[PDB]
Specification:
This is part of a larger assembly, with chains A (176 residues), B (76 residues), C (60 residues), D (141 residues), E (49 residues) and F (117 residues).
Chain B lengths: L13 E2 L14 E2 L5 E3 L18 E7 L3 E7 L2
Parallel strand pairs in B: 3-5
Antiparallel strand pairs in B: 1-2, 4-5
Chain C lengths: L33 E2 L5 E2 L18
Chain D lengths: L31 E2 L6 E3 L2 H11 L8 E3 L5 E5 L12 E9 L6 E3 L4 H12 L19
Antiparallel strand pairs in D: 1-6, 2-5, 3-6, 4-5
The chains are: A alpha+beta (176), B mainly beta (76), C little secondary structure (60), D alpha+beta (141), E mainly beta (49), F mainly alpha (117).
Bound molecules: zinc ion.
Zinc ion (ZN) binds next to loops of chain E.
Chain A binds 3 RNA strands through strand 1, strand 2 and strand 3.
Chain lengths: 176, 76, 60, 141, 49, 117
RNA sequence: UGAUGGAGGUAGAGCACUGUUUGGACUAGGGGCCCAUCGGGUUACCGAAUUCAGAUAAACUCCGAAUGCCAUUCAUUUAU
RNA sequence: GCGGUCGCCUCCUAAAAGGUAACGGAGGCGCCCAAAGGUUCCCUCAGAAUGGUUGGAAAUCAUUCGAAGAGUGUAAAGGCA
RNA sequence: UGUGGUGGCGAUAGCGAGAAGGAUACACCUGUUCCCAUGCCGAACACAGAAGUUAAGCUUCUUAGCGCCGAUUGUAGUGAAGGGUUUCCCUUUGUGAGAGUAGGACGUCGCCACGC
């Protein structure tokens, strides 16, 4: 892709210069994207889960899981075994291409351009971004009729805020 | 008018064999309910967690490091 | 990849009102436009020409 | 009839105890304290009386330490009910004191008000007392 | 609810075995490859009607 | 992200296999050890802890690539060095592994050359 | 009787767990009353996260005694 | 006499082998499961902190700490990572 | 002597913190057509590989901060023998714990292989 060759050519050695790694094996990388859609309303209607799986299968290349319940609470009106959410793991080359799509397409479909929200800090290279909405090219008005969103959990091998910021920054992520 | 005073019966646990006995085949050694002592050489566990004596010999008790103990038989 | 359980997606090229960067993949289809050997030999019909170049984080 | 120091039960009844002997358990917080020299139960209300006879010589507060608290319960039958059936109703909250748990402690006040306060405290408890400082202390930080 | 039940050798026709079922979970008649004493052979046993 | 190093789980599965029966007085163990490049084998009693016969993957005589190719060769050489000492009823260690290659070749080549299972 | 071996949770300690509980420090933010009608949150319990010293228990245990108890091709004495 | 109780199972009383009464102190039982059984593989929990769209202290997520603070069809002991 | 595999002995073997190494070896590491796999996912599992590195693991060495093992004392309790009030305490003879430690402790022993 674009980004692997960016690693092999330009992204790595400047980050090596900023911190003086005695081995190239200490280049921090990008592993995962976890995508989640908690619903809550699908307990009332089993037809709510009919569409989110379709949307996530269109945005990703995978059918997501159908997540369990882990609890039994009537104050949140849940038994065990309740189908609530949907996980998408992402590895390999679809990682980089989905981040390419996030750079080129998603972020210029945001109302009220102010920048990517910084404060996902967490110390240990774990930036998550809530997504509220039609921010994707594989989506119709006449198909999507709900106000569902998305979830991004990118987990790295970095150890600071700063190295994680520069991993996300040399690859994109236009923060505020 | 009390709502108490009702009992189980004494089911008579505890070791029924010393160290250094001369023990025939199959006789019980230490009757449990719950694994308090694991078996060792030539000793098996019954359905109700008792202990046997397969080979004829001498009962001796040991350790398993720090926590729990063993029973084993050594023949002549 | 476990079989029979995945949607369809292909090397779908991008086109754009600013220069049409011909690089990436996608899933949607349509009319055969850029079956071009240096790039994805498939549909380029990711053609919402919202640029990520006319917006003043990339633009200034 | 109001109990100064109730508990949270876990159990309505307990056995009637059997107290022999203790020792040690020196003055820790304050500077002037009693020592029980005997062995009895001590009920709730005696500690109220000890509080009030402590404080009504104390002026503008001072320092009051209570180091003994009721835990256990009594029962009793009615009047005229034969021997026979189950235990009586739980009434009161009592805790035994052996030879030498320090009853209370005082500090911040010179000795004379302190010894008056401890004489007033000792004449409302059924146990003989003494008066102790941090007398022989190698641990004083 | 739960009724005592006896099995049936499907060849020599003797009431061999006995077990228990819960007849709202399992309204049918069971089929297990049990043993036969009279024949010394594995035989598909079924519920006595 | 922590990545648990793979010998830990291999040794956990060993300890959850070895605790049934070693029984190695006259019917000793076999032993099977992966790497990223080679294969090792030992035949041990208890509680002397002595390997009576052994053979590497590619430290004595090779055949080809570090494959099932080698595994058949090692399963040859172990039993060929073994039955000279008179061993018949050896017991497998599964290691902490499963059976999709590089181990069952050793198993089958241990079967044909004189070792009973 | 003497020697040797183990079975075990009694007396006392009884803090580590589960119950009952005494005073200090700390805030993380509950702080009802705030200054309020834009940042300082003033007092109080500082309760839970803690963290100090200090008690305690038939159905509490990190530990744990004398004695009896079961056995020994063991030794002495005695008569079952 | 009126009341209460009559068989079985756990714990304390029970004096550290076993046994041991009182109209002493406490809780259950007269079932359930065709897999909640047998074998063979694989796996490790409750919580706590920190961010994350509807999201609320507490649904679904991600990271770290964590010998158990969980679970074990059913009451209690004894067990079981 | 190193390095790897594999055993017992109560963590005196541990935890935490600090340093060095890549001969051979182990592992990370490049992939997935093949045997296989994912309740989705080459992360694992399984199969192919020799581009790169001691960065982590692994191995050696330092530390008594944490956890562990801890003598001799005394004291509480107690068999036997007694004595006063019998709620309870005291005296002879035998036996003695727990807390508190001075101290020990950053392993010991076994087999095989490959280099040295
Ligand atoms: Zn028949």
């Amino acid at each position: 892709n674009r980004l692997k060759e960016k690693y092999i050519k330009e992204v790595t050695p400047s980050l090596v210069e900023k911190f003086n790694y005695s081995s190239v094996m200490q280049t921090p990388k990008v592993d995962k994207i976890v995508i989640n859609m908690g619903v809550g309303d699908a307990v009332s209607n089993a037809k709510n889960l009919d569409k989110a799986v379709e949307e996530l299968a269109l945005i990703t290349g995978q059918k997501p899981l159908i997540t369990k319940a882990k609890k039994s609470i009537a104050g949140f009106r849940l038994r065990e075994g309740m189908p609530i959410g949907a996980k998408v793991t992402l590895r390999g080359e679809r990682m980089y291409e989905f981040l390419d799509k996030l750079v080129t397409v998603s972020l210029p479909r945001v109302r009220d351009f102010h920048g990517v929200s910084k404060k996902a800090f967490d110390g240990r290279g774990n930036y998550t971004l809530g997504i509220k909405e039609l921010i994707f090219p594989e989506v119709d008005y006449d198909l999507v009729d709900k106000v569902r969103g998305m979830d991004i959990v990118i987990v790295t091998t970095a150890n600071t805020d700063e190295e994680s910021r520069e991993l996300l920054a040399q690859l994109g992520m236009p923060f505020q | 008018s009390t709502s108490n005073g009702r009992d189980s019966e004494s089911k008579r646990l505890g070791a029924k064999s010393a160290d250094g006995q001369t023990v025939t085949g199959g006789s019980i050694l230490y009757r449990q309910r719950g694994t308090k002592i694991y078996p060792g050489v030539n000793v098996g566990i019954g359905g109700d967690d008792t202990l046997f004596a397969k080979v004829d010999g001498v009962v001796r008790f040991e350790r398993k490091g720090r926590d729990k103990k063993q029973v084993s038989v050594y023949p002549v | 990849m476990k079989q029979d359980i995945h949607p369809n997606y292909q090397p779908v090229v991008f086109m754009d009102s600013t220069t049409g960067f011909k690089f990436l993949s996608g899933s949607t289809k349509g009319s055969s436009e850029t079956v071009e050997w240096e790039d994805g030999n498939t549909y380029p019909l990711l053609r919402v020409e919202v640029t990520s170049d006319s917006h003043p984080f990339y633009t200034g | 009839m109001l109990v100064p120091k109730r508990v949270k039960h876990r159990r309505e009844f307990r056995g009637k105890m059997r107290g022999e002997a203790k020792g040690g358990k020196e003055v820790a917080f304050g500077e002037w304290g009693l020592q029980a020299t005997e062995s009895h139960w001590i009920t709730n209300r005696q500690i109220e009386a000890a509080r009030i006879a402590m404080t009504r010589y104390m002026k503008r507060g001072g320092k009051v330490w209570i180091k003994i608290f009721p835990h256990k319960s009594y029962t009793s039958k009615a009047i005229g009910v034969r021997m026979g059936k189950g235990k009586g109703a739980p009434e009161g909250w009592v805790s035994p004191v052996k030879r030498g748990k320090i009853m209370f402690e005082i500090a911040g006040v010179p000795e004379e008000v302190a010894r008056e306060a401890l004489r007033l405290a000792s004449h409302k408890l059924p146990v003989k007392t003494k008066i102790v400082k941090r007398e022989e202390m190698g641990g004083e930080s | 609810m739960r009724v005592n039940i006896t099995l049936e050798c499907t060849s020599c026709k003797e009431r061999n075995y006995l077990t228990n079922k819960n007849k709202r979970n399992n309204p049918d008649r069971l089929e297990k490859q049990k043993y036969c004493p009279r024949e010394r052979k594995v035989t598909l046993h079924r519920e006595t009607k | 992200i922590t990545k648990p190093d793979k010998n830990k789980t291999r040794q956990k599965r060993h300890r959850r296999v070895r605790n049934k029966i070693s029984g190695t007085a006259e019917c000793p163990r076999l032993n099977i050890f992966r790497s990223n490049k080679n294969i090792y084998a030992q035949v041990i009693d208890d509680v002397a802890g002595v390997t009576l016969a052994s053979a590497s993957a590619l430290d004595k005589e090779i055949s080809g690539g570090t494959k099932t190719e080698t595994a058949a060769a090692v399963g040859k050489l172990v039993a060929e060095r073994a039955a000279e000492k008179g061993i018949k009823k050896v017991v497998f260690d599964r290691g902490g592994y499963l059976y999709h290659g590089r181990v069952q070749a050793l198993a089958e080549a241990a079967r044909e050359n004189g070792l009973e299972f």
